[PDB]
Structure formats: C-alpha cells, structure tokens
Predict the structure of Beta-glucosidase.
Amino acid sequence: RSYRFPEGFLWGAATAAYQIEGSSMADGAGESIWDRFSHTPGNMKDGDTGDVACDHYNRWREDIELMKRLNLQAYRFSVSWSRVIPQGRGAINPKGLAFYDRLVDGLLEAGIEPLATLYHWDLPAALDDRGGWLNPDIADWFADYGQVLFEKFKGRVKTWGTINQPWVIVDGGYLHGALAPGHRSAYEAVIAGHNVLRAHGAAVRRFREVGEGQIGIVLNIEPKYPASDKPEDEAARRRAEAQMNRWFLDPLMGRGYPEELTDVYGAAWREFPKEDFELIAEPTDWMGLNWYTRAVPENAPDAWPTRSRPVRQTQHAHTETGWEVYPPALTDTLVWLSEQTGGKLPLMVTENGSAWYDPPHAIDGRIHDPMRVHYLQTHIKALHDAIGKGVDLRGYMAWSLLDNLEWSLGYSKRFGIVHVNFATQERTIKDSGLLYAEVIKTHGDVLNT
Amino acid sequence: TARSYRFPEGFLWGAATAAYQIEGSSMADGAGESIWDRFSHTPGNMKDGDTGDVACDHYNRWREDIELMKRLNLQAYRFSVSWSRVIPQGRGAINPKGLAFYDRLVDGLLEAGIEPLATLYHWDLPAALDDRGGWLNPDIADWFADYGQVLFEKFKGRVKTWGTINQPWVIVDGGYLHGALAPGHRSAYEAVIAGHNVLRAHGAAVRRFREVGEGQIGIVLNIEPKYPASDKPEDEAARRRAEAQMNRWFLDPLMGRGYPEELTDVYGAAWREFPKEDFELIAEPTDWMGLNWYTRAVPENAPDAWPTRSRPVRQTQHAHTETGWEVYPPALTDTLVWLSEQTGGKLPLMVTENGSAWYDPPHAIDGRIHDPMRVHYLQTHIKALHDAIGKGVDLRGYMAWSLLDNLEWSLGYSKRFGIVHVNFATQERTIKDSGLLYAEVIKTHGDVLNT
Ligand SMILES: OC[C@H]1O[C@@H](O)[C@H](O)[C@@H](O)[C@@H]1O
Ligand SMILES: OC[C@H]1O[C@@H](O)[C@H](O)[C@@H](O)[C@@H]1O
C-alpha cells in the first residue's frame, strides 16, 4: 500500500487564541468571556486559567521556528476578537491587530500558509453583556469584525474560517454551561445556535463584498453508531445525531433544521423567519472538519435533552479525554460529509489529534508519546482511505501544534505534537511531532513501511 | 414592663405578593416569555420540578383574593406588575390585554377600600431583554424607565405609592453571582455589573416618575444584619465582608456614599470603577424606602466560601423557620434603627415584607390551619416594629409576606409563607390562625397585642 497523498495536499497544525496566547490584558486588549469564566472558582480543572498558557503572544517568533522544524506548510490559528476590537464593536485596537499582522508576515516569510479562524470561542465580554449569541444583532457585529480582518489581511490570508465548532459553542456554552459563558438553558441554546449560523452567513456575505480568497465554516462531527437493534436505541441514535451532527450542517446545506430537534428541545424549540435561512445558506468555498472520535449512543430517558448516552467501547483504547480511538470512523465520517455536502465542496480536516499523559517536563530532551504516535499514523492512513473513496479532501491540520489550555479541563489534557513545559515555557518536540514532520517531508510515503 | 402596642395615626397595614409567585397564566392574553418562564422549565433548577405555570391561579382568581383581603381587614395590598405581560418584548408594543388585568385589579382594590401598592420589578425580566444582556446591558436603565412610564401614566391618581426594584441583592446575588435564581448566571464579574445597572435603572425610573408620575416612589431593600460570631479578628473581618456585600452594596450608593470599600476585597479582580455621572443617577432622591426583613446572621471566617469568605454560625438557642432562618425579633428593631440612621432619619420607611415559613398540611383540617409558630413570629415581629418607632424610626407601615402560600422561587411550593393557606391541589383558600390574628391586629391598630 502506497500512502502518498494528492498533489497540493496541504499539511499543517492548529491552535486557538485563548488556548495558547496568554497576555490577556496586553496592548489594550479587551476582556473576553473566557477571561471571566476562567477566573470563577469551580469552573476550571485545578483553577487553571489562560492568563499565561503557552505565552505565545510573547513567544511567537520561537514558535514559528518550531513550525519550520516540523516542516509545516500551513498554520491554522484563531484571532482574538477582544484584541482587535476591545469592546466588540466600535474602535479598532491597532496594537492588538498588529500582533496578528506581524505573525502573518512571519508565517509568509517562513513559507507557511496562514489559515485564520475568526471565532474560536472567545466572545468579547462587552458583547456578552449585550446578550452575546442571544442577540440577533451579533450577526452584524460579527460581520463587521470579519471585515476588519478581511481587509487587514487581504492577499495574505487567503483561506478563512468563520466559526469554529458551532456545536461546542452552543452545547457547551448555552445548553449545559460547561464552557463560557456558562449558561444552561434549552431556550437559549436554540436561539444561540440560530444566531451563530446567521453570523456565519453574514460574514460570508461581507467577505464577498471586501475579501479575497476562500471562506467556510468549521464543523465537528462525531459519527453515531448503533448500540443495538432495539427501536428505542435507534431513536436515541437519531436524536443524538440530529442534535450534534445535523443541527448546523442541514441549514448550511439548505435543508432546514432536523425534524428531531422539535423532540429534543420540546417547548424550547422555535421557528424563525425564512430570510434567516437564506442568510445561513450563503454559499461557501470550503468546509473544515474537526474530528476525534465516534460515539455509540443508547436510549437514556433522563439524559437531558437528547435522552441518549454513549455506551463505553471497552474493546478499544481511550484517550485522556475519554474518547474512543477508532480510525475507521474518520474515513466513514469524511464519506458521510462528502455525501451530505454534495461532493463538490472542498473539505479539509482542520483538527485531528489525541490527548495522552505526558510528564510536565522533558526527559533527557525528549517526550516519548507512543499512543499519540499510533493515533497520528493510523488516522492519517484513514484520511488516505477517504481520498480513495472520492472525498475531495485537500489538507490536514494536527490539533495541536502545542500543549495548551484544554478549556475547562485546564492544562491536564495535552494535545500537542510539541510539548510545553508550563513552568519554564520550554518547548520540546514529541515523538509524534517527529513522525509528523517526516509524514510531511515524504508526503505520506513514510507510512508505507 | 407594662407594654402597650398602639401604632401611630395613619400607620398602614397590608399584605404582599409577587406576580410570578401567584399569577399563573404565563402565556395568557399575549403575555411575553420571562426569564422565570425559561428558568422554571429547565430540569434541575426548581425543587420537585415545580413551575409558576399555575401557582395560585391568581390571574383568574383575583376577585376571590380581594374578598380574602377584605376578610383580613387589609388597608393596602402590595403586588408586582409583570413587565412581560404589559410589554411582551420588554420594549416596543404595549399589550393592552395584559395591562387590563392590572387595570381591573387596581379598580377592584380601590372599590374595596384597599390602597394598591405597586412594585415595577419583582424578578421577572422579559426574556427578550435577557437575550439583549438583561441587567448586564447599560441600556436596561432606559428600558426600565420606559416601562415605568407606561404604568405611571396608566395608573396616575390610582396607584400613589410606587416601588421600583424589589431587593437588588437577591436579584444579583441569586441571579448573577451564584445562579440559584433566574437567569442562572454564576460570575462575580457579572454580579458587579448587574448590581450597578439595577441601581442605575432605579435612578432612571425615579427621574421618569418626577416627569410623568404622581405620588411617592422608592426602592425596596432586604437587609440581614450581621452579628459577631466570636472575638477573633478574622471573624470580625468576615462579618464586615458579609455585611458590606449584603447590606451596604446598594444602600450606600443610594445615599450618595459610593460603594463600600470592602467590596474591593470581596470581589477582587471582578471589581470595577464606574463613571461619576452614574452615581448621580443612582442617588436620585426618593420619597420613601421599603425594608424586606426576615432574619439575622452570625458570620464567621470561611476562606473557601466564595466570594465573601464567610458563613453563618447556626444559632441553636432560637427557633428556625422551614427556610432555615433564625427567629430573632430584636434584630428587626436593631435593623430599623440602623436603616433610619443610615438614611439620615428623614426618609420615611415601610416594612414591605416580613413573615415566616412553617410546615402546614397540604389541605385544611376542618376548615382551619393552625400555625402557632407563624402566629408567634407575626406577633413578636409586629411588637419589634413598635419598639423601633419608640426609638424614633419614621416607620409608616407593615406588609405581611405573604397574603397567600405561593411559589417560593427555586424552593417551589414546599415553603409556605401565606397567612392564607392555598391547597395547590384544589385552589381552595383557607385563612390561617396567623391571618386571623393579623386581621385583629389591624382592626385594633395594635391593641390586641397588649394582652
Ligand atoms: O477538545 C479538543 C479540541 O477540540 C476542537 O474541536 C477545538 O477546536 C479545540 O479548541 C479543542 O482543544
Ligand atoms: O424568600 C421569602 C420572600 O423573600 C422576599 O424578600 C421576596 O421578595 C419574596 O419574593 C420571597 O418569597
């Protein structure tokens, strides 16, 4: 078997602003929802915050050198809205925007394609105080913010993501409250999901007016497999699938919301103006897939609101975040996504990776992470399998370039292919990163044998 | 001591309720969704899954309840208006059917000889405004003033005593700091901002009342006095933090004293400085002030008890109500003296809520409800009011919380504060022994308490 990838297939690594940057008040940056959330007791594992993180705002030069050592062809990163427009709407902060301006120039100088994400979960607190994703005006606030970046980086950043993972934003931030802004309401979740979709479409429209390049959304899909042949379990599987995988994809594709959501959300479900769905389905140029695992849901009448719960798949390895390792499901998901998007929408895996225990410091200058290595090589082979089945896949970004703050789980969950000692800020390339650099250099051939 | 309890001329006796706790009919006649409609229909938030969807069915049954007021000899009825009934989206269109309910209620009260005492806000923000940030959005002061105007004009000459905000501390401490009440946020950052905007909204409503209203307007504060747990300095510092956060946070800015210095210690990095013009707005002169009072606390140091780092020491020497609150009537006298001092002695006060929760059976027994501890609480706390008047406090009335057993917010129907029992299975009302005594207190203007 040859694992050589297609001509032009793009290899990179990914991060997010709050998870790596630190410097939360630097250069006139505004407060974000995560600045508040992480400083509230009880919310974060071990009381961890992103105040320092990987100190990447100050260490970006060294990190670009690391990218070159890994042979990266692209770097996927998010822009902190609060840095650029501290009050969310109104005055631009030139100092905060300058950080991204120098970063982007550094990447281009290194021969690395900059892939920017507008929103990776760090709403400015000033907009949260005005209702955040619950305020329908956020579509316009978000389009205006996007315009700042589309214009500033015109001709430099050519591949743009609007929203990273609408499901986590809404399920975590509004439905269950495990993530900022920490609300727990089905009523709110329904509305916030709708405004996230509208903001995406408004940003795409603004991009057509002023931008240059290709724009799209980034979704996470967690494929749902049958727990049994019982009808009540199939219904549970459908509910879980509708709420997690189809909630955003169907309206993006012009199919309206899944019918199952009226069952899942009950009296919290709402209907919206027709014109909203035209906005939401504004044509995009590509779509990103964030992918990590599958689930096997069974009926669970007390598991609000989907009334489903995953059955632990004890036959397989599980990561430190408790996610099953099952590479065939990545191939299956790419195939499904290709079917659902009509097969003519270019796809990229914009995040894939795995968390395993690593010590807090390098040992003899190394970090040996054989299960992360195994996950990496088996999932990249699964990608190649998907390409062989007609999926128009154009790139792969490893989550993550660096160990970082895994949101409410804190620094306890390491996804980096490069280790960060959070005490010293020393970076150490892990064995997974060493392998990945060779996958890129050989364009996959290293996996043959 | 030979003690007598006749009250001053014109001292006003009544009972109090709040819209969400009694009305039911949450979607009737064009009413808009409120934050409590959402909160109560979210699993885990309410004891037993109780909601206000029906409550005491007062939206339908209000005429019966007015007859009950008459049997109690009430001179006044303190009630709240549901914002989202009157202005379903919080701003914009006024709902005439929703406003008509309060219109008929006010006329019914006047015809019965009962003074209507209306509260603009008793915790039921329209959900359309919560979706725009609710008390975190500075524009809420203006939205609230516009809502006030609708009522000030509609009831001009009929409702003459007005309350703006019922208990800022409960709204913010419960709704934004700890999340136990709607809208269920848990953030010191948000609590600091919400408290400031609740104050600004009060000030804006008073300014609007000066322009379009007729009568007397004021805010209603809850105070829970904090007493020393020990002689340890760490416990006195804890007492000061608890007292600043609960009792002075709102009162000091209302009186032009700024925020308590202790709040920088309690809220730390969540604390914010605000523009001077805001404090001008907050301190807009009022005509009267309401005190909601139930109990005291004896705080000790508790480093893990966020954010005040204090916790109450159980006072096992005294009775406690079903809500776990100590029964200690001298602290009512003490608080009224303190509040009089801390308002300069020139602001008329009324006790706008006072009362107690005790177990009652779910149905009347031979047409009665015998509630001797609620009777005890009532008569000893009314005496304590009289003691405060004797110390020079300008107290002008007393409203019993509550006219009716009702939905005790997130504690549900399990905590009964009524002087009238409600059988929630049948909607039958039965005046309790506490209500029967109260009726005689009013009739005798206190004299019954002598014997
Ligand atoms: O949970 C692991 C990762 O999941 C991804 O979808 C998110 O975009 C990352 O921010 C996150 O760290
Ligand atoms: O908790 C007992 C009572 O406290 C009062 O201060 C509130 O205004 C009522 O709504 C509540 O039922």
User: Anything to note?
Assistant: The two ends of chain B are 13 Å apart (CA to CA). The longest helix of chain B spans residues 188-212.
